[PDB]
Amino acid sequence: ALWQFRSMIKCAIPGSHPLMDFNNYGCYCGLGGSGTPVDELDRCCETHDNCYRDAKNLDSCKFLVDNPYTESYSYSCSNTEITCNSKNNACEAFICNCDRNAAICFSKAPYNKEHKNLDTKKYC
Numbered sequence: 001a002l003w004q005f006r007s008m009i010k011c012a013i014p015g016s017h018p019l020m021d022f023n024n025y026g027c028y029c030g031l032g033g034s035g036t037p038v039d040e041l042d043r044c045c046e047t048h049d050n051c052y053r054d055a056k057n058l059d060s061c062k063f064l065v066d067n068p069y070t071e072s073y074s075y076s077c078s079n080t081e082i083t084c085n086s087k088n089n090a091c092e093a094f095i096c097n098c099d100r101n102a103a104i105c106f107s108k109a110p111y112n113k114e115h116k117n118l119d120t121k122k123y124c
């Protein structure tokens with residue numbers, strides 16, 4: 001669920017304020033996205049967006065208000081490492097992996113301050 005992804009990001013990058021660091025960054029970090037990602041951080045976000053698009057295609061899975069962000073799963077944080085609980089159902093596990101792969105991706109991508117609140121109408 002959305003709150004758990006923020007909390008995952010804080011797990012992987014203890015310095016971070018996720019909402020202020022990664023919301024409205026580049027072309028993809030943020031509600032929807034358009035164009036081509038501007039750096040590898042933005043591409044992590046585009047990959048997360050597409051991970052969610054796939055999960056919605058799982059005929060197996062029907063999310064409240066069709067938003068996988070509404071679906072809570074179980075995970076834990078130990079020393080910077082994220083673990084998705086194996087007892088999450090197939091839909092939860094899918095979302096859990098989208099979020100973990102994105103948190104780990106954000107953790108290893110250079111953070112370019114020029115790309116925070118990018119003018120997306122122009123650059124994306």
Ligand SMILES: CCCCOC(=O)c1ccccc1C(=O)OCCCC
Pocket residue numbers: 030031032065066067069
């Ligand atoms: C399916 C309707 C979309 C609903 O908005 C959200 O869940 C949402 C809410 C708060 C912060 C970020 C997002 C987001 O980044 O969502 C990405 C979905 C873009 C269509």
Ligand SMILES: [Ca+2]
Pocket residue numbers: 022023024029030
């Ligand atoms: Ca985000």
Ligand SMILES: [Ca+2]
Pocket residue numbers: 028029030031032033045046049
């Ligand atoms: Ca997005």
Ligand SMILES: [Ca+2]
Pocket residue numbers: 071072073092
């Ligand atoms: Ca659930």
Ligand SMILES: [Cl-]
Pocket residue numbers: 006018019022023
């Ligand atoms: Cl966020």
